[PDB]
Design a protein around this ligand. Structure first.
Ligand SMILES: O=C(O)c1cc(C(=O)O)c2c(n1)C(=O)C(=O)c1cc(C(=O)O)[nH]c1-2
Ligand SMILES: O=C(O)c1cc(C(=O)O)c2c(n1)C(=O)C(=O)c1cc(C(=O)O)[nH]c1-2
Ligand SMILES: [Cl-]
Ligand SMILES: [Cl-]
Lengths: 254, 254
C-alpha cells in the first residue's frame, strides 16, 4: 500500500507493474499461444470474446454519460467510433465478426450471443456496471489494461499463423488494428490517471480498480476453461445441450 | 417456449420445472453431499457464500426502492429483517457467521470478504444489478429459486453430520431456519409471478430470468471449483498468494 503520494512517474510504474497479472499469463491464452488449443477452444474464445467487444462501446458511452467535461468527451467518443465504425464493414466489432468467420463461425453464431457463457457474461457485465456507477475518472482509468494489450495482440500475430494455418488471414485485421488504437487510447488514459490520482488515497484506489479489471479478464478465461478445456460447461451433469440464459435482460426484452 | 399463455397454475409448474437446473446438481455440491469435499472446500464455500448472503438484503432493498406498492413493500421488508436481524435479535447473516465459526473460520475471515473469489463476486453482483435495474416484479420473482432451497438445506442437515462430524452443531442453525423462511417467501413470490406473468411473452421472459438466476448459482460454484478443487485460483500461474480485488468498489471507497 502507498503511504506517501507517489510522483506521477512512480505511479505510472505502479500501474505498469499490475501487468504481472494480465491475462496473457492465463493457461487458456498460453495453450493458444503454444499451438495446443483445439479448433473448438479457439472458436469458443472468439465467440465469447465478442461479448466483451460489443460491450466496450456500451461502457464507453456510460463513461461519457457521466462526464460533464466536453473536452474529455471529444476525445473519449473516438473509442466508440473505433468499435462501431462509420457506415458499413467499418470498425472493430465488424473486424471481430471477420475473425469469427476466419476461424469457422458465422456472423449469426457471434451476433446471436448464444455461445456466451454465463461466467463470461457476468464478468463483462461487471465492467459495464462499474462504468455506469463509478465517477467518470475512475471508470475511464479502468481502461488501462490497454497498457498491456499491444503485447498480447502481437503475440497472436506472431504465433497463430504457424500453429493454426487454417485461420483465414482476414482474421488478423483486428489484432493488427489494436496495436495502434490501444496506444492512442492509453496516451489519454495515462494522462488522465496521472493527473487525477494525485493523492495516496486515490492511487491505492486506482490500483484496486485496475486489479478489478484484471480480475474480469482472468474470470472470462476461467469460464472458457471450465466449458472448453475441462468438459464442465454449465449444467453438464443434467444435460448435453446449452441451457444458460442468452439475453441481456435489462437492455433487451428478448 | 410457451406459445399459448399458460394458466396461473400451469405457469407455477413451469417455474418449478426449472429446478432441474438447480445447483444441487453441481459437482461441488454433490461432492460435499457425498462426503468427498475437503475442509478447505467447505471453508471456501462458507466464506464465498457469505458474499451472497450479505447481498440478499441489498438486493431486497433494491427491489423495494423500485416498488411503489406499499402493500408489497410491507411483505417484502420481512426478507431484510430475516437476514439483518431485528429488535437486535440475531438474523441470517449472524447465523452464517456462526456457520463460519463452526467450520473453523473467524468472524473476521468472513467479514473481511478477502476470500471472496472474483467469479463469485461477479455472479452475485449480477444479481444485485438486475434487482437495481429491472422492474420490481421481475426482480422480485427472480427470488423463486427459493422454491428449490428447502430441499438443498435439508440435504446438508441430513448428510454433513455423518461425513463431517467436526462441523459444530451450532453451524446448522441457518439451514434449519430457511426450511420455514424459504417456504413463506415463495408463497408471496409465486402469487406475484402468477398475477404478473399473464401473457406468453411475460411467461417466457420470466423463465429466462429464472434461468439467469440459476446461472448465477452455478457460476458461483464454478469459481469455487476452479480455486478449491482444481488448483486454479486466479493468478495461480503468477503467484501463490491471493491477488484479486477485495472491495465492493462502487459501494465502499476501500
Ligand atoms: O485481446 C485482448 O486481450 C484485449 C484486452 C483488452 C483489455 O486489456 O482490456 C482490450 C482489448 N483486447 C480490446 O480488443 C479492446 O478493444 C479493448 C478496449 C478496452 C477498454 O477497457 O476500454 N480493453 C480492451
Ligand atoms: O443454500 C442455498 O443453496 C440457497 C440458495 C438460495 C437460492 O436458491 O437463491 C438462497 C439461499 N440459500 C439462502 O440462504 C437465501 O437466504 C436466499 C434468498 C434468496 C433470494 O433470491 O432472495 N435466495 C436464497
Ligand atoms: Cl486493445
Ligand atoms: Cl433459502
Amino acid at each position: 500500500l502507498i503511504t506517501d503520494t507517489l510522483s506521477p512517474q512512480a505511479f505510472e510504474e505502479a500501474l505498469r507493474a499490475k501487468g504481472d497479472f494480465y491475462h496473457i499469463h492465463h493457461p487458456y491464452h498460453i495453450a493458444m499461444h503454444n499451438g495446443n488449443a483445439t479448433r473448438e477452444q479457439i472458436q469458443g474464445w472468439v465467440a465469447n470474446r465478442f461479448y466483451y467487444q460489443t460491450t466496450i462501446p456500451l461502457k464507453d458511452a456510460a463513461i461519457m454519460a457521466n462526464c460533464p467535461d466536453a473536452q474529455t468527451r471529444r476525445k473519449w467518443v473516438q473509442r466508440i467510433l473505433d468499435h462501431d465504425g462509420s457506415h458499413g464493414e467499418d470498425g472493430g466489432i465488424e473486424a471481430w465478426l471477420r475473425l469469427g468467420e476466419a476461424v469457422g463461425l458465422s456472423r449469426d453464431d457471434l451476433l446471436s450471443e448464444r455461445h456466451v457463457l454465463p461466467g463470461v457474461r457476468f464478468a463483462v457485465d461487471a465492467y459495464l456496471n462499474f462504468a455506469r456507477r463509478a465517477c467518470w475518472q475512475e471508470a475511464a482509468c479502468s481502461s488501462l489494461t490497454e497498457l498491456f494489450a499491444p503485447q498480447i495482440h502481437q503475440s497472436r500475430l506472431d504465433s497463430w499463423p504457424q500453429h493454426y494455418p487454417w485461420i483465414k488471414e482476414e482474421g488478423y485485421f483486428f489484432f493488427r488494428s489494436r496495436l495502434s488504437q490501444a496506444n492512442r487510447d492509453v496516451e489519454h488514459g495515462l494522462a488522465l490517471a496521472k493527473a487525477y490520482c494525485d493523492s495516496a488515497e486515490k492511487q491505492n484506489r486506482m490500483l484496486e480498480i485496475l486489479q478489478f479489471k484484471l480480475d474480469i479478464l482472468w474470470s472470462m478465461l476461467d469460464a472458457m476453461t471450465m466449458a472448453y478445456a475441462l468438459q464442465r460447461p454449465p449444467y453438464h451433469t443434467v444435460t448435453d445441450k446449452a441451457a444458460w440464459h442468452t439475453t441481456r435482460l435489462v437492455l433487451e426484452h428478448h
